[PDB]
Design a protein around this ligand. Structure first.
Ligand SMILES: [Zn+2]
Ligand SMILES: [Zn+2]
Ligand SMILES: [Zn+2]
Lengths: 337, 385, 453, 66
């Protein structure tokens, strides 16, 4: 019942809806009227509610105001949200019944063990004199478009091609990530990509074992897909939404193999710029990592860099990239919002 | 109802003697929970030169966790320890690693005593799918036909690791009773956390001893119970002859360095595919190869090496026991006859004959490591005759 | 850069001192109390057997027999064990006893050592004044509290006490030491940089170093005496003495003793006399190495799980002071669990430099019975964190120098390369731009050489 | 040829290029640069090097902060 779905209005048995956050002047004329009137036919039913940390208190008004049910269901991994110690949540949903231990899922249970990796790299200094020269958001794009990041990025692809298991990389924005999908060209998406071929990419990824590598953008974690993989690499770390990023990895990372050993088999990677906002943010980020506490390691060096035929081994090639960055604008340096 | 009833379980067990001294007797009951079965030995008759047969159920029962992340992980890890502690105690023997997987039986490692070969096999046995159902009939088929060609002067025992599942095999294994009862081969299984009556009838029709796995500690106990060479059925054999005493060779005896390496495809010995320089020598082939206190393939007799294996059980039978008293006869200056200390946890350990005072750490050190009271020494050998 | 020798120096204490002075002055270092001092502050196992023959070797054994005592395995370790033992000046290389150099020890030490091996009722053994338990007037664990609290009134008054230290002239040596200092008005007993490092240290051998440097400030008494007396302290405890330190007195032996209760390691009664007392402190000086006995107090286990400092045990205020330098800013109550900072405790080494092992030492010294049932790997990654944190701020290596640029030739530059490499006054060269990083101390010898040609 | 009483500092090229920016953001002209060799080796007029023990880390932390 959302985004012109209108699937079985007449006769409601068991329904899926979406939080009618409307409050508008004839937003959906008959459609939200049906959402109003078939709520009345729903009587009470059940309030299956995913992750109400996403719900604002202004929408928690419309939780009880619109929906006046007699049994609720809060499916919320978050315990405490939005720094709002004024309004609690048992007045909304009653008791908060059960939480499941990580230990009895990650050590005794199907949930895999993530190795979280905030990996920072020594950059080339010809990204940084410019950075400190320029107090303007092109400076953000400087450390972003780094072959020192790419040398890490190039690395773990072939390092985990040798285990023949699924890997996924999440960048920040497209046109830097695009050249990764140009240089070592992989499956990839962006914002306006056609979904029917995005689904083929899921078919090419989640079914086909020949290519365990894939690129995603801001949209794919959020608006199109729940990826189902084993090894995650991240580039984006700028905004202070700790959990929102941490629940992306918490959803995607599945069991790597049927591994006999008791080791860590799910894998997280982050690419961190030294001496940067990224260095600074990661300090609070790894603070948030140890705030919940998981298998975490900072590595800086590779397992033999020139073991692989590293592209951008010459800095002149990196200077070729640098002049693209000198030709670049702010437009490659903004997310979906 | 149950929200109270879930915590009627907790509330009393949390509670104890209050006021002062709280959470104290709860620790005392945990010490009172301890002290399980000690030895209950004292046997005679049989147990010599076993010819064991590891039989492994490889099934879908392994996928249950129940003690470890895999039931093989419970199994396989301590088998290596069971291998090593066997070769510790019983080097006069050898073991057939045979694996059942997918309704067949693979004799994985042959009946032999080379530990590294057996252990790396277990290290190879790590990444086993254990696909398919158990078939004991294929396992007994290998067990027959191999041990059929062994002498009747051989101890004939089989150790089956079964995962308590359905014994999925045809061809009248109930009639394999009279097959193997006549064949004087013993078969011992222990069930993984459950029981198979037919297999329980099998072992009670065997004379092999059946058990059920309780816990990982308990898993070790029955291994340890089956470390010792058991008194199997009467009328097996008396003797076993042409026990070859070897020589060590130094290859520097008279002709110094007349041979660059003592393995060049013509020398008497040189059995295994590797270079050697002369370390050993058997009587009958006059076989010189890598040193092995077992047997050979050309003389085909037993490469006995007496200080090792004719010494191991040679004191593993003739034991006696101690006694315990809580009393205070203060022998010494409140000391021990062994380690010479005192704690007095009322276990003053007195020998049966020489009657000397010991502690747990002196009793355990005898009853696990020394295997005899040395207080009998100075007391036996001086009037001995 | 920063000094890093003032922390450990545990073989050079008996080498760089001893080899920095005369053989006849270290001949004084063969007092019979100084015999145990030789064997233990060196820790080779290899020279520790090359001694063992000499009690039975009056004869100078030939050099090749022990030069070939050990074959192909660890010839360097034999060689590394050799010249240092020779660098003790305890050996004599004979000329041609039988035809070739056959080495031998100094016999006067062999005289002194064998009395400390078998027999001898001599002056340190007995007969004059050594030791005396007559009747128990005072007990050791009570005096162990003294052996704790004097460390406090040392170590707290380093940081600064709301209480006060006793009337010592030692602060005018510790301000002289560069540990402490004081500006001229009122003389504030602060810390310069190095007591802070010694706050991060925990052994008495630094005190011992300034007590070896005690006579160095224009004082002329027995340096021979005090280092004998440094051993003569290292006798465990359990001895009051019928004023046996006055029956075995000397001038500095009694006066500097007044300071050993300032240093706390002796305990003196009325009139600073009538007895003497060695403290259980008299065995960790003997090594300086960590030691299982060096536990001071037994608080408990720690961990640093989730690198969040993770521990409790309300301890004394000196440990609270030991982390008052090391963890404030989200302190909590009655368990001492100040949270973690990867910047502030990182900034709390800037006044020290790197405390790399001194973390790891105070890792096994925060709550002391932690190694009882814990992992061997106590920091899993957390060492490397501390390392990378220490490897973050150290962005500079301070080194002065003289650089030779725009040289008139290119091959005569390689001469001056070979000239400076002969001198060893170069630090670095660039041949591609005709550059040489040369020490400015060895500048003058090339400055003299260039002006001659 | 030219007596150079500067101070060699050795570090990563990441910071070796950075001190040029500290030379350009020096309050005075160029003193912290005398001549730098290639990638790891520089020369400073020895005035505030002791201050630059802490003047650098106080600056780089702040610049990245915003
Ligand atoms: Zn033969
Ligand atoms: Zn005992
Ligand atoms: Zn006895």
């Amino acid at each position: 019942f959302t985004s012109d779905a209108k699937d079985k209005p007449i006769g409601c048995s068991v329904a899926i809806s979406t939080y009618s956050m409307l409050g508008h002047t004839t937003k959906r004329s008959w459609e939200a009227e049906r959402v109003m009137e078939w709520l009345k036919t729903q009587e009470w039913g059940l309030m299956i509610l995913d992750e109400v940390h996403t719900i604002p208190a202004k929408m928690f008004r419309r939780v009880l105001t619109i929906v006046q049910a007699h049994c609720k269901l809060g499916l919320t991994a978050t315990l405490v949200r939005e720094d709002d110690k004024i309004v609690d949540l048992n007045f909304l949903i009653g008791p908060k019944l059960y939480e499941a231990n990580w230990m009895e899922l990650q050590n005794n249970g199907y949930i895999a063990k993530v190795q979280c990796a905030e990996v920072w790299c020594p950059m080339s200094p010809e990204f940084y004199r410019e950075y400190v020269a320029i107090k303007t958001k092109k400076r953000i794009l400087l450390y972003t478009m780094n072959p020192n990041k790419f040398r890490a990025c190039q690395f773990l692809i072939k390092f985990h091609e040798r285990r023949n298991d699924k890997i996924i990389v999440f960048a920040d924005n497209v046109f830097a990530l695009k050249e990764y999908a140009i240089r070592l060209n992989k499956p990839y998406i962006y914002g306006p990509t056609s979904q029917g071929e995005r689904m083929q990419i899921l078919q090419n990824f989640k079914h086909n074992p020949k290519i365990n590598t894939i690129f995603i953008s801001k949209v794919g974690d959020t608006s199109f897909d729940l990826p189902e993989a084993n090894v995650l690499i991240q580039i984006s770390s700028h905004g202070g939404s700790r959990r929102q990023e941490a629940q992306r990895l918490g959803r995607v990372l599945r069991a790597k193999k049927g591994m006999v050993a008791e080791e860590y088999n799910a894998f997280f990677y982050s690419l961190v710029s030294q001496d940067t906002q990224e260095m600074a943010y990661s300090t609070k980020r790894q603070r948030f990592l140890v705030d919940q506490g998981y298998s975490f390691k900072v590595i800086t060096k590779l397992a033999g860099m020139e073991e692989e035929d590293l592209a951008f081994s010459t800095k002149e090639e990196q200077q070729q990239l640098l002049q693209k960055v000198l030709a670049a604008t702010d437009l490659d340096a903004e997310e979906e919002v | 109802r149950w929200e109270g009833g879930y915590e009627r379980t907790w509330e009393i067990l949390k509670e104890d003697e209050s006021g002062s001294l709280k959470a104290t007797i709860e620790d005392i009951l945990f010490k009172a929970k301890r002290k399980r079965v000690f030895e209950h030995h004292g046997q005679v008759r049989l147990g010599m030169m076993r010819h064991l047969y590891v039989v492994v159920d490889g099934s879908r029962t392994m996928e249950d966790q129940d003690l470890k992340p895999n039931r093989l992980t419970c199994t396989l890890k301590l088998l290596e320890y069971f291998v090593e502690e066997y070769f510790d105690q019983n080097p006069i023997s050898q073991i057939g690693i045979i694996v059942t997987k997918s309704k067949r039986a693979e004799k994985l490692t042959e009946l032999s005593g080379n530990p590294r070969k057996h252990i790396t096999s277990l290290k190879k046995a790590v990444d086993m799918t254990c696909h398919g159902e158990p078939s004991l009939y294929n396992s007994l088929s290998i067990a027959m036909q191999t041990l059929k060609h062994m002498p009747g002067h051989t101890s004939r025992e089989v150790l089956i690791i079964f995962s308590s599942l359905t014994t999925c095999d045809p061809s009248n294994i109930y009639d394999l009773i009279k097959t193997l009862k006549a064949a004087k081969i013993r078969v011992s299984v222990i069930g993984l956390s459950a029981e198979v009556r037919v297999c329980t009838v099998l072992a009670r029709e065997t004379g092999g001893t059946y058990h059920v796995i309780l816990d990982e500690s308990h898993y070790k106990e029955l291994l340890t119970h089956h470390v010792s060479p058991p008194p199997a059925s009467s009328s097996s054999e008396c003797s076993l002859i042409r026990m070859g005493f070897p020589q060590h060779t130094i290859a520097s005896l008279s002709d110094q360095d007349a041979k660059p390496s003592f393995s060049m495809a013509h020398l008497d010995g040189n059995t295994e595919p590797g270079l050697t320089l002369g370390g050993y020598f058997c009587p009958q082939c006059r076989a010189k190869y890598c040193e092995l206190p077992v047997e050979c393939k050309i003389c085909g007799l037993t490469l006995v090496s007496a200080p090792h294996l004719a010494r191991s059980y040679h004191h593993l039978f003739p034991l006696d026991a101690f006694q315990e008293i809580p009393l205070e006869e203060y022998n010494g200056e409140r000391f021990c006859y062994g380690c010479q200390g005192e704690l007095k946890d009322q276990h003053v350990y007195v020998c049966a004959v020489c009657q000397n005072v010991f502690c747990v750490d002196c009793d355990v050190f005898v009853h696990d490591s020394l295997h005899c009271c040395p207080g009998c020494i100075h007391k036996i050998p001086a009037p001995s005759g | 850069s920063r000094g890093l020798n003032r922390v450990h120096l545990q073989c050079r204490n008996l080498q760089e001192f001893l080899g920095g002075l005369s053989p006849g002055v270290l001949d004084r270092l063969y007092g019979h109390p100084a015999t145990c001092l030789a064997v233990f502050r060196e820790l080779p196992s290899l020279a520790k057997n090359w001694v063992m023959r000499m009690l039975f070797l009056e004869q100078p054994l030939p050099q090749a027999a022990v030069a070939l005592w050990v074959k192909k395995e660890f010839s360097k370790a034999q060689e590394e064990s050799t010249g240092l033992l020779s660098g003790l000046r305890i050996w004599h290389t004979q000329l041609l006893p039988g035809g070739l150099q056959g080495l031998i020890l100094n016999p006067i030490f062999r005289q002194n050592l064998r009395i400390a091996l078998l027999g001898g009722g001599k002056a340190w053994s007995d007969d004059t004044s050594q030791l005396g338990p007559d009747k128990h007037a005072r007990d050791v664990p009570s005096l162990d509290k003294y052996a704790e609290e004097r460390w406090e009134v040392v170590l707290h008054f380093m940081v600064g006490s709301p209480s006060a230290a006793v009337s010592q002239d030692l602060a005018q040596l510790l301000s002289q030491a560069g540990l402490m200092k004081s500006t001229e008005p009122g003389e504030p007993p602060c810390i310069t940089s190095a007591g802070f490092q010694f706050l991060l240290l925990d052994t008495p051998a630094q005190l011992w170093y300034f007590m070896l440097q005690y006579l160095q400030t224009a004082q002329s008494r027995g340096m021979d005496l005090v280092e004998i007396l440094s051993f003569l302290f290292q006798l465990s405890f359990s001895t009051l003495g019928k004023d046996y330190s006055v029956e075995g007195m000397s001038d500095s032996l009694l006066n500097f003793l007044q300071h050993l209760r300032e240093f706390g390691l002796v305990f003196q009664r009325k009139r600073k006399s009538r007895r003497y007392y060695p403290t259980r402190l008299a065995i960790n000086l003997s090594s300086g190495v960590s030691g299982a006995g060096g536990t001071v107090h037994q608080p408990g286990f720690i961990v640093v799980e989730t690198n969040y400092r993770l521990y409790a045990y309300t301890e004394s205020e000196l440990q609270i002071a030991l982390i008052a330098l090391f963890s404030e800013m989200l302190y909590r109550f009655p368990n001492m669990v100040v949270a973690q900072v990867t910047r502030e405790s990182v900034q709390q080494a800037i006044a020290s430099g790197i405390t790399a092992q001194q973390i790891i030492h105070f890792l096994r010294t925060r709550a002391h019975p932690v190694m009882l049932k814990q992992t061997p790997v106590l920091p899993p990654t957390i060492t490397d964190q501390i390392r990378l944190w220490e490897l973050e701020r150290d962005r500079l290596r301070f080194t002065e120098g003289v650089l030779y640029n725009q040289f008139l030739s290119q091959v005569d530059f390689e001469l001056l390369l070979a000239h400076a490499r002969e001198l060893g006054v170069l630090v670095f060269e660039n041949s591609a731009k005709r550059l040489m990083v040369v020490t400015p101390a060895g500048h003058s010898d090339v400055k003299r050489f260039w002006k001659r040609q | 040829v030219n007596v150079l009483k500067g101070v060699l500092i050795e570090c990563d090229p990441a910071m070796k290029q950075f001190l040029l920016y500290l030379d350009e953001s020096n309050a005075l002209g160029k003193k912290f640069i005398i001549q730098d060799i290639d990638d790891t080796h520089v020369f400073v007029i020895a005035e505030l090097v002791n201050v630059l023990q802490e003047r650098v880390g106080e600056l780089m932390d702040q610049n990245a902060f915003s």
